[PDB]
C-alpha cells in the first residue's frame, strides 16, 4: 500500500530536508501533489562525511515526462537517492531477491578489508 | 552616550573582534613573507604570525598557491561564523545582513553554471561558503528567472530584491544575468543602508553610513565604466544600476547613468573632491583598496560602535587577497612586482 | 601589467603633418578603448580623438578637426597622426587606455602614457 | 510613543490642576510648605540613607560589567591582560564601600524622638540634611562607577595590544576615581552639623 | 650549601657554552636530561626558516603529521592507544642516558 495512489518517483532523503522538498514540490506541480513518506528508524552514516543523519524513505505519483525529469533534478539537487522499484509486488521481490544475495555477498568483501585494516 | 548601553550584549563580541585586529599582518610582516624562497618557506615563516599551524595538516608536495587560498580563506569564515553565533538581536540581525551580498554572489555564480552546462557538484565548490543556504543547489533546475523565483528565490530572505528583475525577456543568457546581478544588490545595499539608519547606534550609524556609502560609489564608478562593454545599455537600465546611497547621488550618479563614453565619466567625477583623481592617474583597482583600508582603519579608532565587525572582516579580506598575491610571485617564480601588496596597518 | 608608452612629437615647424604612436603590451584590442589626450602649458588636459571597442571613432574635431584616427589591432600597437600643425598645438599628447577587463563589473582596467612634448 | 505620551499627559494634567486652584482663588492649597514641614523627618532621613547605598551599589555594578564584559572578551586571545587589568576593577568596587561609609556614618544619627519637639527647628533640619546629603553620595558614586567602568572596559582593550598603552591610559582612570572621593567629601559636609533626633 | 631560595630567588650565573659541532647533538640530549638550564636567544634577528637547523625540524615536523594522522585512524577505527611507558628514561630525575 505504500505505493498505492513508470508513474512515480522514489527514493532516500534525509529527515532535516524533506519538509523541504515537499514544500517546492507544491508549487511545481501547482498543488497536484501525492506526496508521501516514511521514517527509517536508525541513524545513517554518511561515510563520505563521517558523520550519521536520520534518513526518510518517498514516493511520488506523475506521469508527465517532463514533470517526472524535472521532479528527478529536484530531488537529486537536494541529496537524494532515486531508484528504479519495479511496480508489480512480484516485481519488487523479483528486485528484492537479487539485492538480498549482492548485499549478503558484499558484506564478505567488507569483512577482509576491515579485519586486514584492523589488523 | 550609547557606550554606556553597548557593553550589555556585546561586550564580548567587542573583545573578541578587536582580538582579531592585534593579529592583521603589519607592513613589517609582510616583507618578512616576501622574503621566503619557496611556498614551504612561506608557511614555516606564516607559523611566526597570528594565523599559527593552520597548514600544518598539509603535506610539503601538497602545497600550491590555490590551496593557500583555501584554509587562509576557511579559518576567516570559521571566526566569522563563531562571532555570529555569539550574537542575537540587532547585533545578529546586522551580521546576517553581512553574508547577503555574498549570496547574492552565489546565486549569479550558480545560474550561469547552468547557462553553460557545468555540473552542481563542481560549481557547488567555487560558491562562496558565506552566501550558502539550504536550498542553493536547487538553481541548478531551470532557466527561466521566473521558475526559478517561484519555485526557489520566493523563499530566501533575497525575495524583496527582485522588483526590477522580472522585465527580462523570456530567454536567459549570461549577459542577463550579470544585469540581474546588479540589481539585486542596488536593492541590497539600499535596503541595507536603510536598515543601518533605524537600527543601529551612533556612533555605528554614521560609521557604517560613511562605509556603505563608499561601496555604492565603488560599485558605481565601475558599472559607469564597464557598461560600456556593449554596443550600448540604455541609460534608464544603467539608472537601475547605481544605487542611491553613494556620495555621488544624485549629483555625479545621474551624469554617470547618463554617460555614453569614458570622458564623460571623467568629467562627471572631475567634481567629486573624494574622487576627483581616482581616473587621472595610476592604477584604479589600488586606489579602491587603498581608500577602503583607510577607511576600515579610521573606523577602528571609533570604541564601542558595531562597525568594528564590517572594519575587521574587510581588513581580513584584503589580507587574504595580499597573501595570495604573494604566493603567486613565490610559486610563479616572479618578483618584479611582488611588493604591490596593500598595508595600512 | 599593461605598459604604455608613446613616442614621435617634438618641435616641428608650422603647417606641416605629424605622427604619434603609442605601444601596448600584455593585452589585444579584444575589449579595448584607447585616447589621445592634449594638456597645453594651460594646466587642464583634453580629450582629442579616440579609438572605441567597436570601431567608431570620437574627436574634437570642432577644433582638431584634422586630426586622424588609425586602428592598429593586427600589429597591436598605434599609430595616430595630424595635419597642418598650428602653434596653439603645442602641448604634451598622452595615449589612454582602457580596458574592459571582465564580464564582472570588477574596477576595471585603466592605464595612461608617460606624454609626448610637441612645440611649435 | 506610548511612555513619552503619558510624560506629556502627566504634565497637562499638572497644568490644569494648578490652574483650576489658582482661578478659583485657592491657589495657596498647593502648599509645599505644608508638606515639609509636616511629613514625618524620618523619611527624609531614611530614603536618604537607602538610597545612598543603593544608587551607589549600582554605580558599582554599572561599572563592574561594562568593564569585566571586555576584559574576558579581549582577554580570550591575551589573557594576560586579566590580572594586570583587574586595578580598573577595583576602582569600580571601590565606590561601593564610599556609600558603605556614609550608610554607618548616618545610622549613628537615628534615635526615637520624643512627641512634642519631633518637628521641631533641629529635628527637620536633619531630616533634610541626611536626604540630600544621602542622594548627593548615591547619585555621585553612581556617575562616578559609571565613567570608571568605560575606562576600564577600553584600557583592557588597550592592554590586549601592548602594555605600553596601559601604562600611560591607567592615567585617565584616576581623574574618574577621584569625583566618587569628592563626592563622598561634600556627603560629609553637608552631614557635619547635624544632630540626631531628640 | 644550596641556598633556601624561598626569602630571595635564588642567585644565578651567565653561562656559555664551548660545544664541539660532532658531540652537539650528543650533549644536547645530556642538557635536557639534567633540566638545569635555559637558553637564550642569540640568533633573535634572524628570520624563522633561515635558522641553520630548519631542514631537520621540517623532516620530524612531517613526521609528527603522520604520527597524529594515525592517531586519528586509532580513533575513527575506536582501536585504543597501548599504555605506553612513561618512566623509559627516568623522566627527568637529572640522570644521565
Known sequence: ?119 | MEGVYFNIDNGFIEGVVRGYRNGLLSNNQYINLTQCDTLEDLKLQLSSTDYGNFLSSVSSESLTTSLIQEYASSKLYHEFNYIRDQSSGSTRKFMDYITYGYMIDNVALMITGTIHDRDKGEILQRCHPLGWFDTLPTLSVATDLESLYETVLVDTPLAPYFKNCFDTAEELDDMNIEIIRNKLYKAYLEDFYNFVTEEIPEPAKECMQTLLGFEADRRSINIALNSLQSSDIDPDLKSDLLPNIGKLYPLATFHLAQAQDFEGVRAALANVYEYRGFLETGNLEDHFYQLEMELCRDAFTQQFAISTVWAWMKSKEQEVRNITWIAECIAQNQRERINNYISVY | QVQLQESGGGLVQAGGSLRLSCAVSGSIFSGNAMDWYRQAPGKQRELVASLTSTGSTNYADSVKGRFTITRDNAKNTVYLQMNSLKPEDTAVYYCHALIYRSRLDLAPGNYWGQGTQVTV | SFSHFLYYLVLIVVIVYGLYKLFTGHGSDINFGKFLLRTSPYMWANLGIALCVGLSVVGAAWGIFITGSSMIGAGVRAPRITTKNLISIIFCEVVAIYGLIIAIVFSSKLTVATAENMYSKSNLYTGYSLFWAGITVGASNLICGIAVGITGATAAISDAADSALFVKILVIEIFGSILGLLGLIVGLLMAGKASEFQ | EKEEAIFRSAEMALVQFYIPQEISRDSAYTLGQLGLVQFRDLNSKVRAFQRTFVNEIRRLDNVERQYRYFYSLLKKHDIKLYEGDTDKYLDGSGELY
Not at chain 1, 529527515?15 to 545513517?44: C, H, M
Not at chain 1, 548485499?103 to 589488523?119: F, G
Open chain 1, 1 to 119: 500500500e505504500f505505493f498505492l495512489k513508470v508513474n512515480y518517483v522514489t527514493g532516500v532523503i534525509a529527515r532535516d530536508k524533506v519538509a523541504t522538498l515537499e514544500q517546492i514540490l507544491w508549487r511545481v506541480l501547482r498543488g497536484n501533489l501525492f506526496f508521501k513518506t516514511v521514517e527509517i528508524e536508525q541513524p545513517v552514516y554518511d561515510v563520505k562525511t563521517r558523520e550519521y543523519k536520520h534518513k526518510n524513505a518517498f514516493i511520488v505519483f506523475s506521469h508527465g515526462d517532463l514533470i517526472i525529469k524535472r521532479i528527478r533534478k529536484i530531488a537529486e539537487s537536494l541529496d537524494a537517492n532515486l531508484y528504479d522499484v519495479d511496480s508489480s509486488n512480484e516485481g519488487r521481490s523479483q528486485q528484492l531477491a537479487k539485492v538480498n544475495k549482492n548485499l549478503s555477498d558484499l558484506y564478505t568483501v567488507l569483512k577482509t578489508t576491515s579485519t586486514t585494516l584492523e589488523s
